[PDB]
Amino acid sequence: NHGRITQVIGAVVDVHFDEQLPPILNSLEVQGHTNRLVLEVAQHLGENTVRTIAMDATEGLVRGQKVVDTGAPIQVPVGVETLGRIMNVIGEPVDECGPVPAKKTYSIHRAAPLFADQSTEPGLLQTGIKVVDLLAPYAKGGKIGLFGGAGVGKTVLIMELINNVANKHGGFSVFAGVGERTREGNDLYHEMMTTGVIKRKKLEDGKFDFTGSKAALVYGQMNEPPGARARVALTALSVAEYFRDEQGQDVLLFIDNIYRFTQAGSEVSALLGRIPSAVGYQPTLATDLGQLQER
Amino acid sequence: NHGRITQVIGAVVDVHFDEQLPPILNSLEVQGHTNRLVLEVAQHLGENTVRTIAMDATEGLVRGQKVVDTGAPIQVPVGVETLGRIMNVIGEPVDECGPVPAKKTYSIHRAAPLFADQSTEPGLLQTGIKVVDLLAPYAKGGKIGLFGGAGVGKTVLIMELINNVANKHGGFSVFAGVGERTREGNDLYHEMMTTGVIKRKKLEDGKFDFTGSKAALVYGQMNEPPGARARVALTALSVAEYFRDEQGQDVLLFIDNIYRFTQAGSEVSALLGRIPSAVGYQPTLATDLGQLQERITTTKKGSITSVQAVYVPADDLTDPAPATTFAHLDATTVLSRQIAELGIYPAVDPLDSTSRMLAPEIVGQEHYDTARATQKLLQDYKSLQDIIAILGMDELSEEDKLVVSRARKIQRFLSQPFTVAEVFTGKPGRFVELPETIKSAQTILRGECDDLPEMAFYMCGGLEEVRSKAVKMAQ
Amino acid sequence: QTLEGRYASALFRVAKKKNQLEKVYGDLESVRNALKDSSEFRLFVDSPAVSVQQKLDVLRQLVNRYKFDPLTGNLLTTLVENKRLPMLARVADAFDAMY
Amino acid sequence: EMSRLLEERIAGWKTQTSTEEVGRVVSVGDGIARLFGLEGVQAGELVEFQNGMTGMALNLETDNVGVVIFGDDRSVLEGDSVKRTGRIVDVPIGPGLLGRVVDALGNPIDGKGPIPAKERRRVELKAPGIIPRKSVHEPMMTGLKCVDALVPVGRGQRELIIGDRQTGKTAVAVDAIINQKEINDSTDDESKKLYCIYVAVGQKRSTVAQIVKALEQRDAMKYTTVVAATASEAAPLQFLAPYSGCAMGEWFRDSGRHCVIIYDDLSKQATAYRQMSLLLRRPPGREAYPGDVFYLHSRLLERAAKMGDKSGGGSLTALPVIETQAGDVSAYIPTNVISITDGQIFLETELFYKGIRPAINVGLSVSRVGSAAQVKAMKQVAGTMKLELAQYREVAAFAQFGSDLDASTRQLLTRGTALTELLKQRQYSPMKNSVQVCVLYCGVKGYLDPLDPKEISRFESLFIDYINANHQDILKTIETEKELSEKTEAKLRAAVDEFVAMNEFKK
Amino acid sequence: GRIVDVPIGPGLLGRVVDALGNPIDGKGPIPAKERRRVELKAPGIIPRKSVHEPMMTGLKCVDALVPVGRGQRELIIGDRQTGKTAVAVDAIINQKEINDSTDDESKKLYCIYVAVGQKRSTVAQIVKALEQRDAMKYTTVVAATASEAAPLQFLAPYSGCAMGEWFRDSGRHCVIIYDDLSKQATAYRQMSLLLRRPPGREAYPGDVFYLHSRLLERAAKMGDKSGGGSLTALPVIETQAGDVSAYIPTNVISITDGQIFLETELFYKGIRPAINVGLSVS
Amino acid sequence: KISPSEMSRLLEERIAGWKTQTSTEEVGRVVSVGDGIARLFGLEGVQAGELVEFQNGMTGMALNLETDNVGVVIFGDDRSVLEGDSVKRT
Numbered sequence A: 001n002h003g004r005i006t007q008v009i010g011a012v013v014d015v016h017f018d019e020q021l022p023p024i025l026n027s028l029e030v031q032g033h034t035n036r037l038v039l040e041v042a043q044h045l046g047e048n049t050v051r052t053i054a055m056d057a058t059e060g061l062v063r064g065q066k067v068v069d070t071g072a073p074i075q076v077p078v079g080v081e082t083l084g085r086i087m088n089v090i091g092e093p094v095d096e097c098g099p100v101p102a103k104k105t106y107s108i109h110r111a112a113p114l115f116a117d118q119s120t121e122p123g124l125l126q127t128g129i130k131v132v133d134l135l136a137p138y139a140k141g142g143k144i145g146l147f148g149g150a151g152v153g154k155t156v157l158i159m160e161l162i163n164n165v166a167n168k169h170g171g172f173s174v175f176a177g178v179g180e181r182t183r184e185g186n187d188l189y190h191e192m193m194t195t196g197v198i199k200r201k202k203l204e205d206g207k208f209d210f211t212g213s214k215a216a217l218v219y220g221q222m223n224e225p226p227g228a229r230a231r232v233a234l235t236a237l238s239v240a241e242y243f244r245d246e247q248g249q250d251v252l253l254f255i256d257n258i259y260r261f262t263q264a265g266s267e268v269s270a271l272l273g274r275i276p277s278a279v280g281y282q283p284t285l286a287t288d289l290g291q292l293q294e295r
Numbered sequence B: 001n002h003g004r005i006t007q008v009i010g011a012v013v014d015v016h017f018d019e020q021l022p023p024i025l026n027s028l029e030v031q032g033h034t035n036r037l038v039l040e041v042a043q044h045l046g047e048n049t050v051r052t053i054a055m056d057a058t059e060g061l062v063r064g065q066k067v068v069d070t071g072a073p074i075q076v077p078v079g080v081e082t083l084g085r086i087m088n089v090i091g092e093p094v095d096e097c098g099p100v101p102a103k104k105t106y107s108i109h110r111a112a113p114l115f116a117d118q119s120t121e122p123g124l125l126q127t128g129i130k131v132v133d134l135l136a137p138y139a140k141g142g143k144i145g146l147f148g149g150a151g152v153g154k155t156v157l158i159m160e161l162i163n164n165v166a167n168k169h170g171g172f173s174v175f176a177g178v179g180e181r182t183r184e185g186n187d188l189y190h191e192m193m194t195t196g197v198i199k200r201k202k203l204e205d206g207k208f209d210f211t212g213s214k215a216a217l218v219y220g221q222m223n224e225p226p227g228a229r230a231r232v233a234l235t236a237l238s239v240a241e242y243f244r245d246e247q248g249q250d251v252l253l254f255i256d257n258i259y260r261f262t263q264a265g266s267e268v269s270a271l272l273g274r275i276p277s278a279v280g281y282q283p284t285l286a287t288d289l290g291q292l293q294e295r296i297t298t299t300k301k302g303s304i305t306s307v308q309a310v311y312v313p314a315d316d317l318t319d320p321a322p323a324t325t326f327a328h329l330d331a332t333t334v335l336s337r338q339i340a341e342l343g344i345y346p347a348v349d350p351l352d353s354t355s356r357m358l359a360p361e362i363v364g365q366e367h368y369d370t371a372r373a374t375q376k377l378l379q380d381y382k383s384l385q386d387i388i389a390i391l392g393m394d395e396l397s398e399e400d401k402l403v404v405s406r407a408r409k410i411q412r413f414l415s416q417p418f419t420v421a422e423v424f425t426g427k428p429g430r431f432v433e434l435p436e437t438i439k440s441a442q443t444i445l446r447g448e449c450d451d452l453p454e455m456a457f458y459m460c461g462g463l464e465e466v467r468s469k470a471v472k473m474a475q
Numbered sequence C: 001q002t003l004e005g006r007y008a009s010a011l012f013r014v015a016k017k018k019n020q021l022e023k024v025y026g027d028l029e030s031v032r033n034a035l036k037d038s039s040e041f042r043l044f045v046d047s048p049a050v051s052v053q054q055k056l057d058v059l060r061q062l063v064n065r066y067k068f069d070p071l072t073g074n075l076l077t078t079l080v081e082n083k084r085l086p087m088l089a090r091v092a093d094a095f096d097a098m099y
Numbered sequence D: 001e002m003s004r005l006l007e008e009r010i011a012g013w014k015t016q017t018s019t020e021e022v023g024r025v026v027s028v029g030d031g032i033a034r035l036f037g038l039e040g041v042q043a044g045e046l047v048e049f050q051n052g053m054t055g056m057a058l059n060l061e062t063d064n065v066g067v068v069i070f071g072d073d074r075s076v077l078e079g080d081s082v083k084r085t086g087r088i089v090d091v092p093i094g095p096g097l098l099g100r101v102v103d104a105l106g107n108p109i110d111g112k113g114p115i116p117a118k119e120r121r122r123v124e125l126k127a128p129g130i131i132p133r134k135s136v137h138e139p140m141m142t143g144l145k146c147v148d149a150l151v152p153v154g155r156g157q158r159e160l161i162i163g164d165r166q167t168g169k170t171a172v173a174v175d176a177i178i179n180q181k182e183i184n185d186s187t188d189d190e191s192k193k194l195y196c197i198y199v200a201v202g203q204k205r206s207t208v209a210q211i212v213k214a215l216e217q218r219d220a221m222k223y224t225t226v227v228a229a230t231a232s233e234a235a236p237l238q239f240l241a242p243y244s245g246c247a248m249g250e251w252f253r254d255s256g257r258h259c260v261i262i263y264d265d266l267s268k269q270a271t272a273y274r275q276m277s278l279l280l281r282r283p284p285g286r287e288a289y290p291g292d293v294f295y296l297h298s299r300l301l302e303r304a305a306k307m308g309d310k311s312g313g314g315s316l317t318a319l320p321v322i323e324t325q326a327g328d329v330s331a332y333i334p335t336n337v338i339s340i341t342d343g344q345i346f347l348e349t350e351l352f353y354k355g356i357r358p359a360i361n362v363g364l365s366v367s368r369v370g371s372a373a374q375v376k377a378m379k380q381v382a383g384t385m386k387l388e389l390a391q392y393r394e395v396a397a398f399a400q401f402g403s404d405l406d407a408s409t410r411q412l413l414t415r416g417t418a419l420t421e422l423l424k425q426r427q428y429s430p431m432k433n434s435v436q437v438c439v440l441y442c443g444v445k446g447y448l449d450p451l452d453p454k455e456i457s458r459f460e461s462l463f464i465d466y467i468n469a470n471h472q473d474i475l476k477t478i479e480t481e482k483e484l485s486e487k488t489e490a491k492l493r494a495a496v497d498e499f500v501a502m503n504e505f506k507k
Numbered sequence E: 001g002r003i004v005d006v007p008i009g010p011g012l013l014g015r016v017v018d019a020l021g022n023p024i025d026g027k028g029p030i031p032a033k034e035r036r037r038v039e040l041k042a043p044g045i046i047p048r049k050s051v052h053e054p055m056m057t058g059l060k061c062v063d064a065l066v067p068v069g070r071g072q073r074e075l076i077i078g079d080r081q082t083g084k085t086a087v088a089v090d091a092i093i094n095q096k097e098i099n100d101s102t103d104d105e106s107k108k109l110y111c112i113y114v115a116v117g118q119k120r121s122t123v124a125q126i127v128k129a130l131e132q133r134d135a136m137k138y139t140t141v142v143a144a145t146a147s148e149a150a151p152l153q154f155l156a157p158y159s160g161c162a163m164g165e166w167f168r169d170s171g172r173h174c175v176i177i178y179d180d181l182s183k184q185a186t187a188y189r190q191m192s193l194l195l196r197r198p199p200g201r202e203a204y205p206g207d208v209f210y211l212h213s214r215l216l217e218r219a220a221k222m223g224d225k226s227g228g229g230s231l232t233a234l235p236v237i238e239t240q241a242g243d244v245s246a247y248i249p250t251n252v253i254s255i256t257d258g259q260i261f262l263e264t265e266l267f268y269k270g271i272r273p274a275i276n277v278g279l280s281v282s
Numbered sequence F: 001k002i003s004p005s006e007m008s009r010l011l012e013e014r015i016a017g018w019k020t021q022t023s024t025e026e027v028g029r030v031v032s033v034g035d036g037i038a039r040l041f042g043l044e045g046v047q048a049g050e051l052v053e054f055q056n057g058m059t060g061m062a063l064n065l066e067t068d069n070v071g072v073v074i075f076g077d078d079r080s081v082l083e084g085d086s087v088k089r090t
């Protein structure tokens, strides 16, 4: 399809199509300016018009600007090729090392596992840490809170969990940065390249050879608008669901920070004009957190 | 006149008439429907369009259904035939005993009595309860309020007042259930059939004979839409106004809880197209209540005593509903959760409770002085709660320690085991006259009971029971 | 004043000024009678399944197939452009209420 | 007159005329949809979209129709066609749901096949009245000592399980479900059997799977059906699922069969309703909740009733569950539900962190029905137990000074501590009524006072095995007579004496 | 064509009337020929003078520690059931001796009791208490009760000020009491919300300050050229939980020449009237 | 509720068959002013965050593009701007 922008209210773009509107959650690509702009549908309004949240900035947009419908939601690449790389919410890499040559793509909006395809037998996760396995045993399919900031040794714990789960359980890992500081991301990337979690070996021509690594990265930067910071955890979650389903191995997902994801949802709901809930949060808080955490 | 339904929003229905409109408050009947759905007009909107509130569920209505104007507001029957019979808001009996063969019907909506037609003669009631008889005397022919949250003992207190007043009344009585549990409604019906307040008799041919009854019943409960909850109290008030106008006899009206009536407006005004007030309540929160309360008043013809249980959401007395309701009452009784956690029942806060019939020109000076001394004592004890919690009783002086002792003793002494609580308490009921209460309070204040323990005043009634319990506790 | 009032005042002015009054009056009366008698033109106006292009095409066919002035055609195109076609009948009453 | 013109140009105009039974979507968003058409649609009517998704005809405006979508807003597009099912929102009922997990609308999810169909009872029906109703006069065997003794739950009651998160609410529910196995298998008469329903609302899917697995292990799904509306599911389904479960139980109530419905947690349903309301631009109130929350919960709970002798005699309990925040029950939703129920079962985090499990407080927990929901054998014991625990609660303020205090106070503390250690139970380990009576008879007769507290656990277990080996006649006599006569009492004392003789403990 | 107006004169004395001057005592019409507009411009800076004469309240703590003058605007703010209406009624009753022992209207003090939101039983009790002491031949009452619609509750205090401006401009002193003003604010909020006007803080409009300033600035002490009259005001306000940090109390505190605070702790300790002489000023 | 195109000066043109839409995408007419905000009709082609210039030399930023109007914030006072003024893109 081909449509036209009808209005721009900050990060809220209303678009018009002539026929065969796109469903909700679909992706739309703007044509006619740099800084590739992706728009996620969120609401139908009538008159063959839709409302969209932008993943990037809307400065320099024009009414009547042409827009294409990809025909499916934001599709992230998946594979063992995403290991050692960095990726944004729209799957593009931001590590300055080339494109992701993956033979597959998964939507970030995927239905959760059904009631039948779910395991009733719980089981611990053999980390290799004494205090953890003794006094706060983890579990498979679990969700573990980690209350601690900096100055405590959190990053080293993260790298140790990744390495130990990759060695023993043979399972890879994923890290999602939901609105993190950029220098912190650079520090984490360099610490990973140092500790051997990532293996970025130069090649002769000038490319890189990300050989057997133990973690993919998905960074949603703080400078990114709301809509990107809200759809980053789903990207990493799909990247992990790839390993869960076809690969069939246990994986570790790290989200830093869950609250930031909640903030992004609240902002996005405020832009679209939805009446806020009790403490300013959105009225779709528990529902969205469940759409995330049930996967 | 025939009309058409144009719009349906939950408990609100917008109807369109062609020739002539009906006035406001008029009743409308929907024809193509299973039950008898009644609609009360509320607004006019132009284009010969009308907005209405439904007295029953709107599931099944269609945009196009036909509606018939009855030409008058809702009509409830009146007479001695409503006695010993249950009746919903539209007058239809739900007692499964036959129809109501009453001659006259009154409108649900009536203007209140005027200024000149009032008679504020001060009297008193014999409730048998120590706390209200001492510190908040109830006024014969006035309004009485029982404010409390959830689980503090309003319903039990109303049932106790029924057992101790209505049976010993002689005149008539009415009970309105506005958003209460249907269980307690059936319980009250059977207790009334037991105590003889309702005298039902089954004739050979299936008919019934309620001759001898002294209490009517009106029930609009939680299993009802808001429109059928915001018009039940008015039904009960019409039924009682008939008695105290034509009959000219004193009547007792009990309402459980009145707050539900305002709550219905809260879940209606949003649909009527009105801007909300502070806490989502209506802008009409005061007039819709004053128009209900001003109909309750003693006059030169008769008298209505009223006992209203007022819910207090989230234990917040600054809520608009109880705040507005406080202005309409002649006597007050504020129940508390902090006092119920101590096992004291009735959990009446004697400081927030008050009354207009406490002055010495109504009750004697010994009663007034005892009440005021008790209030002073309890306030002096309240003033030390912080320093007792932080530091302890040892920091206090000896006068303050004596005060604390007497205050705990008089708190525990203002605790009565009712008759209706025997089912979950076991201990028998204790009716208590007023002079015994006054003598006991005088003795506890003087210092003629400092030798006794503190747990000897718990659920004992008079003082002879307290001394007997202290004797038995000495062992 | 109102929306139909605005369109009716504009049409009244431009009809009293340049072209005619009786022509547009008879046109509006015929349109109102067709709306109240056909029972499908009304639904064609109210229904959203009809595209704006199909609407304009049917309106121009009605222009050609009947005694019709261009002022009323521009009125109909404007009401379609602003999503005010359901306000035709009302507007007609205003043009009949000015008599 | 002119229809040929439209038929010629639009090329299909004649088909879009009948807007009485077919409609067209116009707008979509926030779980709400707007339709043009469907003039003959009933309020509350079920509506079927193009891609199999369904909805409720909530609002009937003058031209448009506002619809609630039982699903996610991705299977519904502007332009989609919409049909009429011709019936109000309904769900299947009867035998056929037993042993089957289903969604809010009777659609199965456990992967075992379709479900048979009655006439599909409606969802938002009205409750019964005052005459056909009856007072509660018989119990609901939960299998927990503290509940069956001190907080007795009747049959036709609405008792609330309120407490903060991670305190043992779902445990109480599942124990109540499991204890009915021996009573149901031993009867073969549906008047005495007790079925059950477990409604999960906003609960994690893993927990529901684990519960179903634990019930299938213990053969407790022959008489249970589960209604799942989890966190991933939309908000309308969470708003419904309680009403669907109550509609499934109304069949047993009207038939004369006895059923118990458990709601996990109702607060989640209130949150879903708040969501749907704020998305319809309605005006918020206290804690942003609208005013129609009380009506929601009260519609739901007033259906729980004990029908009379003429209405079949059925019953329908209800064990709603609520999660508080820091034990605050002076909030809005807890107080709204306390004003609706006929009781209250409180649970604390202090007792749950110490080790006391089930963490059922007893001074805050109450029950309006009380002894009427008990048998005489358990009355005679639980009265003394409740009195002694009241005394212990009173005199526990000065327990550290037990040496300075009289022998009476120390005896009260010892008896209270023994009873408190006796009310404890394991997970998925209920107890029969006769066994409870025997154990509490041992407890309230000083046989545990000299005994050490920690031993009282294994003591109990051993004692049970003893009375399940030789004294089965006592158990059958109690289960039949429902009374502790002097002969059975003397037999029980002799058995207790023989047990204390044959076995050694720390004291 | 008439702007909303009310009658004025000595025909109102001894009578009970609604917000619009229509009587409700049930005994005869109102014999008054001259009318007065309800909403009017207050008197300016020049036709005024300092407050020098006292208004004998009859109480001891007020007349001693929190004195009141003629031309003053002193608030009576407190919680529910603390002794506010009692203070005002004692102020009314103390004047019968002062008025009986003279025939000079320049020294007599007439009184006006405006009852907004009250129930008719309470107003009847007050009228009875005044008649029992012969304290009605110099008072009138303006009853805008709860059953009465919002506009009457909104207009009743302005009607009372209009009735008192006759005394103020004729050289005769008068005292007007408003019970409670907050009820008037609530009525105004109701009317404004039903006229689809947008709300503000606590759902009130922004014009509440203007409402009470319009009303209380009409109290004044005029000069010797304008007769020398006066109109004292004694508004009443009911706070909730003693919160004078609220929106209406704050305004009416900032536009009055004094305060008489009343507390429940002092009321139950034994101090009646429960006047806190620390916060109360003049 | 009326649109800037629905005012009773333009419909006198549309009804009269006037097709003088040769007014470029550069020029627009002010429609509303207040409190430091202006609302324009036209400028179909202006970018978001773009500067615009009024008759009296003042300039503003276009922020709220809409289907029927354009929202502009002013780098100055509103006494200079008045309804009917012309606006051009920079």
Ligand SMILES: Nc1ncnc2c1ncn2[C@@H]1O[C@H](COP(=O)(O)OP(=O)(O)OP(=O)(O)O)[C@@H](O)[C@H]1O
Binding pocket: D164, D165, D166, D167, D168, D169, D170, D171, D172, D323, D357, D358, D425, D426, D427
């Ligand atoms: N008698 C018991 N003995 C030992 N553990 C128990 C007992 N009862 C409950 N538990 C344990 O408490 C924990 C929580 O159980 P449960 O899920 O029933 O509580 P909950 O209130 O429903 O928590 P949630 O808020 O997640 O729903 C479980 O680990 C369970 O094993």
Ligand SMILES: Nc1ncnc2c1ncn2[C@@H]1O[C@H](COP(=O)(O)OP(=O)(O)OP(=O)(O)O)[C@@H](O)[C@H]1O
Binding pocket: B327, B355, B356, B358, B359, E079, E080, E081, E082, E083, E084, E085, E086, E087, E238, E272, E273
């Ligand atoms: N000097 C006083 N001495 C003893 N009692 C007093 C005194 N003044 C007032 N009271 C008593 O206080 C109680 C309340 O009287 P009052 O009419 O003044 O209430 P209020 O402060 O106006 O509050 P509200 O009218 O809203 O109920 C009465 O019982 C009254 O007898």
Ligand SMILES: Nc1ncnc2c1ncn2[C@@H]1O[C@H](COP(=O)(O)OP(=O)(O)O)[C@@H](O)[C@H]1O
Binding pocket: B148, B149, B150, B151, B152, B153, B154, B155, B156, B345, B346, B416, B417, B418, B421, B424, B425, D339, D366, D367, D368
């Ligand atoms: N005098 C009392 N004695 C013992 N328990 C009481 C007493 N009053 C109330 N209760 C308890 O508090 C609860 C209050 O419930 P209810 O009587 O319906 O009051 P409410 O209407 O305020 O909810 C009862 O279940 C009861 O157990």
Ligand SMILES: [Mg+2]
Binding pocket: B154, B155, B180
């Ligand atoms: Mg109650």
Ligand SMILES: [Mg+2]
Binding pocket: D169, D170, D171, D264
């Ligand atoms: Mg649980």
Ligand SMILES: [Mg+2]
Binding pocket: E084, E085, E086, E179
């Ligand atoms: Mg007063």
